[PDB]
Design a protein around this nucleic acid. Structure first.
Lengths: 50, 141, 116, 151, 100, 137, 73, 186
RNA sequence: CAGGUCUGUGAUGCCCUCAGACGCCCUGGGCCGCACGCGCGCUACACUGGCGGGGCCAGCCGGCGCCCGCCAGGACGCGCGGAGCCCCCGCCGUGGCCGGGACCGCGGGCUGGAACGCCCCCGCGCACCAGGAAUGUCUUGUAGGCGCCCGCCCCCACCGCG
């Protein structure tokens, strides 16, 4: 039934913690953060420009 | 030393000046059938030059090229190993390699294989991008 | 006519496990090293039902979306239609076809058809 | 691997009163020096013989200049980490040049030798200021940029 | 009494982590705290194309969040180590963790 | 010291001779077909390559001393660039089987004793390797 | 093209040597250019001159090796 | 002190009075590998050791970029070949080779409005020292390329042929060609 | 600045879609199909070079032992480790050759639900023998030569950040 087929695992689903976008999720460190969404919230995390 | 200017064996005139391993490369796929150096264990000195070869050495060299298990050289040094139609690990050499590409192509054509159509219509299998750099002279091919 | 040194008919009467020692490196990994799926096994279930046990020699067709299926010698001289993503493509499985993927023998592209 | 936590731990003290450092583009020569026989080991290998040939004469260059007999009576356990084959030889030479001077004692004669050596080969007692520059986003190098496709 | 304690001090700001170090040194006179060990900073580095859209020269925004850790080892009783930690001045966004 | 005093290149070639004349190591002879690792494209033509390789590997074991060395680790010392592709060359350490075989013979000839992690040169071996270097020079 | 590369000299051994000696200093490739022989061949010839005491190795390298006759007068 | 501690370094002298100040053998010291800020200021390169600049132009065409070690070894193998044939100091022949190989005359646009005529001009002694060292270096490379003669034998002869003044040297012929063009548009 | 992104955004006007959905899943293929013209790169065009050994020097910042296998890989175990270039000796001897490595014929493997990805070995041996008109980048640790790291990463880079 739809129950037995809905979302059968096919792949890992990885989304920015802030925006939920699959593209450019970023796994470099624990930060699963959108590449575009990162820049907006970099300051609260404290990542800073040299 | 007594030398043979051109060594006619294997349908390839073999130059006498070249070193034995390098001259033997000119014999179709052989000369590399020994990975470029397996006659050294089987019979001849590894680097004596092609014309320094002697009748006894020539007979010995041909026997090991003909028989892989004569000196028990492994299938890793050999060419076709599973063999679709032979079930044998024999190295394919001389006229047989020229026959084998055509022979395999007949199988690639007989089974309606996706590879086979590309082979007959002279295209490339995979190669990733096949539109941009495939072209050789106003045509890929 | 010989396949892997057998006369030719010798291959037909064989389970995949029987011909597995004499197989290509890749088809050892999928059949034995990693095993097969139950829906893929259901394809074999559909074919034992549709085998010589199936009534009549007239075609029973059989259309499968499944593409990555190394063919067993049980399918020698069998014809079925496999999806290219748009059309199920009839292909004659045969002793040469065995030991290779079913996906390649059906074709999805357009053969280029260029020169426009 | 340059500037390791222990500057010299394979040999510690053991009469090694003189200490010197020679720097050469990520090449640090941590030199342990004692008043010994007069032969020296660099990275536990004899100073007179090093694996590169052209560089061997350069490695012996400060020795002859600041009095080979003066250097006699001094044993060294200099270790060079980091850098590269050429960088390493220049940093051992800087350490060697400084190493004899500190031990000799500061007097008119020491000063005369120091002047004679630093004139013969400049920047022998002075660590090279130049340090590898940093690649920017423009291209592949610190100064080089990518090719301009449309001018 | 003599039971060893390994403590770790982690802070985004060097000055803020320095404040905890200076406080620990002052309150470590009573329980014989070890001298501080300043770890090589481990940096979370994100270089991102600044432009949300590709239009424009490809340009790179370099973001760095180096994390500073200080190491403290005290062979002292647990009440004593808790006494140094509670008494030492605490600044928000500074992490101190103890491992036995 | 003293091992350093002999030019290491001079010691390695002589040690291969010492191995052959004194019967130490014994080249496997299954080494004939193998090339020295993935990078090499033409295969060793020296014909004393196992004796030549063995001489340096035992000298390397002496050079490390107590440090302790592993079969994959020795291959990193013997690494060379891999060429022949459009993609640019990348360094490739040597194949483990030949190196592992060399370490095995030394443990039998008392030149190697297992330590924590990798094996290290045995005390009987330490004297033999050092004695040869001083004797040769 | 200096094609012969197997100690080819048969009665021109002396001639090749008269040429080699006529030159106060020779190089392996200078032999190959001056005469019709390959540089690899020169490497084996040069040896029977050095050992006899005809020529002296002034400079040595796997690449460039330079030989000068001891006397010749 | 001797060049490479083999060929004796004596009081090598300069025969030109123009190339005397800009060619330097006084600061010649074993191995021309000295790491110096010679490419600094505008005139520091003048005090450079003659062999060092010649050595630096050997790592060229991108094939050998940065290979000073190999370049010194080629300078060394060449130095010996010159020493063997001429029986004198290579460091003296190298000085004669550079002074002769330097084009004496040059020509330049002078930016006379639209006219691009190459009106003749005098040369800098320093510029002459560089062109001569460059001509010897690029000629030596042309002679080799796909030839049996390897670069060390080519470099030695090129210095030896430039020193006499023979037209065959690329270094001399470049000097001759440039000055023939310079008189033509004087 | 009508530069670009509504396809990063519980960003968003307004129209369309809305149960046979432009919701959401499930399958197989697509984006990688090539008569073509072009942009960014890579590897070449060899002796200043390849190739066989011998030494061995790094930074960003980072772990390994044992055995089996031609490698590839894997099993077993555990607390840790490190390039090229270059240098020294050999081989080739100017030959599309021992320059160069392009497709394809197999074979052995990996990540994988799954190659249609990658890897290695044994064949094969593509043009190019230095690029026309045109233009680009570039000044001290600089260009270039030469490797390594990291990103996206199931597997993968010739790419970019370094």
């Amino acid at each position: 039934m739809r129950e037995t087929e809905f979302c059968t695992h096919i792949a890992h689903k990885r989304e920015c913690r802030i925006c939920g976008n699959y593209n450019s999720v970023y796994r470099k460190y624990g930060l699963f953060i959108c590449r575009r969404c990162f820049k907006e919230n970099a300051g609260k995390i404290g990542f800073v420009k040299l | 030393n007594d030398y043979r200017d051109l060594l006619r064996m294997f349908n390839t005139n073999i130059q006498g000046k070249v070193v034995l391993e390098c001259a033997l490369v000119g014999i179709k796929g052989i000369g590399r059938r020994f990975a470029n150096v397996a006659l050294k264990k089987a019979n001849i000195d590894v680097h004596k030059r092609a014309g320094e070869l002697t009748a006894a050495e020539e007979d010995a060299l041909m026997k090991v090229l003909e028989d892989p298990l004569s000196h028990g050289i492994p299938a890793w040094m050999l060419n076709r190993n599973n063999d679709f139609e032979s079930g044998k690990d024999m190295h394919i050499l001389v006229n047989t390699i020229a026959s084998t590409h055509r022979a395999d192509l007949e199988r690639l054509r007989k089974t309606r294989c996706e590879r086979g159509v590309r082979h007959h219509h002279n295209l490339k299998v995979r190669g990733q991008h096949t539109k941009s750099t495939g072209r050789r002279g106003h045509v890929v091919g | 006519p010989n396949f892997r040194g057998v006369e030719v008919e010798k291959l037909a009467t064989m389970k995949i496990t029987d011909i597995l020692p004499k197989l290509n490196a890749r088809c050892r990994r999928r059949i034995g090293k990693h095993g097969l799926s139950m829906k893929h096994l259901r394809f074999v279930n559909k074919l034992r039902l549709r085998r010589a046990a199936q009534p009549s020699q007239k075609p029973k067709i059989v259309r499968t979306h499944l593409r990555d299926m190394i063919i067993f010698p049980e399918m020698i001289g069998m014809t079925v239609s496999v999806y290219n993503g748009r059309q199920f493509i009839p292909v004659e499985i045969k002793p040469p076809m065995v030991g290779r993927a079913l996906r390649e023998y059906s074709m999805s592209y357009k053969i280029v058809s260029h020169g426009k | 691997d340059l500037l390791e936590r222990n500057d010299i731990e394979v040999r510690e003290r053991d009469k090694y009163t003189v200490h010197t450092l020679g720097k050469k583009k990520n090449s640090v020569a941590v030199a342990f020096v004692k008043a010994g026989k007069g032969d020296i080991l660099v990275n536990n290998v004899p100073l007179a013989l090093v694996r590169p040939e052209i560089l061997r004469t350069k490695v012996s260059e400060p020795i002859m200049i600041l009095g080979e007999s003066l250097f006699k009576g001094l044993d060294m356990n200099i270790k060079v980490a980091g850098g590269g084959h050429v960088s390493q030889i220049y940093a051992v030479r800087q350490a060697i040049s400084r190493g004899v001077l500190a031990s000799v004692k500061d007097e008119a004669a020491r000063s005369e030798l120091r002047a004679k050596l630093v004139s013969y080969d400049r920047q022998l007692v002075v660590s090279d200021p130049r340090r590898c520059e940093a690649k920017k986003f423009g291209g592949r190098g610190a100064r080089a940029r990518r090719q301009k496709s449309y001018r | 009494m003599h039971q060893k304690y390994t403590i770790i001090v982690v802070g985004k700001d060097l000055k803020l982590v320095e404040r905890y170090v200076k406080s620990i040194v002052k309150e470590g006179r009573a329980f014989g705290i070890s001298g501080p060990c300043r770890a090589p900073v481990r940096r979370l580095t994100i270089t991102t194309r600044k432009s949300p859209c590709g239009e424009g020269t490809n340009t790179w925004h370099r973001f760095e969040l180096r994390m500073y850790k200080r190491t403290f080892w005290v062979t002292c009783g647990g009440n004593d180590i808790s006494t140094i930690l509670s008494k030492t001045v605490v600044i928000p966004g500074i992490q101190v963790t103890v491992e036995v | 010291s003293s091992v350093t005093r002999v030019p290491a290149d001079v010691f390695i070639n002589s040690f291969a001779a010492h191995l052959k004349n004194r019967g130490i190591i014994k080249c496997p002879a299954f080494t004939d077909y193998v090339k020295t690792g993935v990078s090499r494209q033409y295969a060793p033509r020296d014909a004393d390559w196992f004796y030549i390789k063995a001489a340096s590997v035992i000298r390397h074991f002496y050079i490390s001393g107590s440090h302790s060395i592993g079969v994959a680790g020795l291959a990193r010392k013997y690494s060379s660039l891999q060429k022949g592709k459009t993609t640019p060359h990348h360094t490739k350490r040597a194949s483990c089987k030949v190196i592992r075989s060399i370490v095995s013979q030394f443990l039998g000839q008392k030149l190697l004793i297992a330590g924590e992690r990798g094996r290290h040169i045995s005390p009987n071996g330490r004297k033999m390797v050092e004695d040869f270097a001083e004797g040769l020079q | 093209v200096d094609y012969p590369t197997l100690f080819a000299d048969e009665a021109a051994m002396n001639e090749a040597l008269k040429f080699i000696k006529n030159s106060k200093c020779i190089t392996h490739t200078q032999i190959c250019e001056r005469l019709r022989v390959s540089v690899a061949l020169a490497k084996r010839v040069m040896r029977q001159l050095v050992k006899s005491g005809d020529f002296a190795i002034v400079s040595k390298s796997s690449r460039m090796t330079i030989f000068k006759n001891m006397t010749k007068k | 002190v001797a060049l490479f501690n083999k060929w004796p370094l004596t009081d090598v002298k300069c025969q030109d009075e123009s190339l005397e100040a800009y060619i330097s053998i006084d600061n010649h010291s074993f191995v021309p590998h000295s790491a110096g800020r010679w490419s600094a200021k505008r005139f520091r390169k003048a005090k450079c050791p003659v062999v060092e600049r010649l050595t630096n132009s050997l790592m060229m065409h991108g094939r050998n970029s940065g290979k000073k070690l190999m370049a010194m070894k080629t300078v060394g193998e060449a130095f010996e070949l010159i020493n063997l044939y001429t029986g004198k100091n290579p460091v003296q022949v190298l000085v004669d080779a550079v002074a002769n190989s330097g084009p004496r005359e040059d020509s330049c646009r002078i930016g006379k409005g639209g006219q691009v005529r190459r009106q003749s001009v005098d040369v800098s002694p320093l510029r002459r020292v560089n062109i001569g060292i460059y001509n010897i270096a690029t000629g030596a490379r042309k002679a080799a390329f796909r030839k049996v003669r390897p670069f060390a034998e080519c470099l030695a002869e090129e210095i030896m042929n430039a020193a006499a003044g023979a037209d065959k040297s690329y270094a001399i012929s470049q000097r001759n060609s440039v000055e023939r063009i310079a008189v033509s548009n004087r």
